[PDB]
Structures are given as C-alpha cells and as structure tokens.
Design a protein around this nucleic acid. Structure first.
Length: 97
DNA sequence: ATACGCGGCCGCCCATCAGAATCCCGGTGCCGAGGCCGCTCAATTGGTCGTAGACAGCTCTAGCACCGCTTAAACGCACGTACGCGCT
C-alpha cells in the first residue's frame, strides 16, 4: 500500500496552478465580506457584479506576490517553511506600513 | 705643675609679617526676535458675459434577493515522515 513521499504532490500543483489564470477566492464569501466593511462607513450600498471582480483580482494577485517575498527570506535562513516573522519582516522592509 | 672658668652651640617655647585662597560681587560674547523700509509687481477691486453644472424628469439597465437541484470543495481527523530548530 502506497502514499506519495512528502513534497511530491505540492510542487506538481504549484505549476498546474501557475499556468492558469482563473481566480482562487470564492465569489459569495468575498462579496459578503466586502459588503460588511462598506456598511461600516455607510450602510446598505450596491455594486455592479463586475465591480466586485475588479476588486477581487487586485488583491488575489497581491498576496501571491507577498508570499513570494516571504519565501526568499525563508530560504535565506537555510529554512524550508515560510514562518511568521518572515512575512512581517517582509512587511517592515518593504516599508509599506 | 694642677685645678677652675667659659664660650659659642643649641633645643625650647614664643613673638611678627607676608602670601595664598575662598567668597563677594562681574563683564563679555552669542543668539534670535525685532524694526526699519522701499521700490513694486502681484493680488484686489469693481464689472461684464456666458457657460458649466446644478436640478428636476425620465426610463431603463443591473444589482438584489431568493430558491433548489447538484457536487465540487472544504472539513476534521489519523498517522508518520522529513523538516524546524537546538546543540556543539
């Protein structure tokens, strides 16, 4: 009986997932969340279904980029798994915040 | 030939006059608001025309809601491997 050796599945997908364009985040929950905050400035406002996507794309890509910076720093240390600080470390250096 | 005298020397406590050092009052240099000001060219003033844009009417897209059949994706847990990370 058989189970793939660790780290054999993850890379395979990386690429599969790298080749394609299609969004990873969910249409319903995303939307609800967007509505949640927008209400908190002013309550009960509307957006064209696309207007929601416009918003959805700009952030989905945004993370994937940060994860990439997080990874280099994980590597720089002789490590293998993106730890917390690395993200923060990354955040601090970019000096966005 | 043999015995007495003393002489400046000196430690002693005791006296006089100048110099060192702290406190009572100080001048000096640096920084930053002030004042002065004056020739003047950019804002203000009084004024006309016209056009953006507020506004009200209107219609006509699309954002919401809502439902249920279908199912892919998320979930949670079980088991172990191969890394995080600690030490030397």
């Amino acid at each position: 009986p058989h189970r793939y050796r660790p780290g054999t599945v993850a890379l395979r997908e990386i690429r599969r997932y790298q080749k394609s364009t299609e969004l990873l985040i969910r249409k319903l929950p995303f939307q609800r969340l967007v509505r949640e905050i927008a209400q908190d400035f002013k309550t009960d406002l509307r957006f064209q279904s696309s207007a929601v996507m416009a918003l959805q794309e700009a952030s989905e890509a945004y993370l994937v980029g940060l994860f990439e910076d997080t990874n280099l720093c994980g590597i720089h240390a002789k490590r293998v798994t993106i730890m917390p600080k690395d993200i923060q470390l990354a955040r601090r250096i970019r000096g966005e915040r």
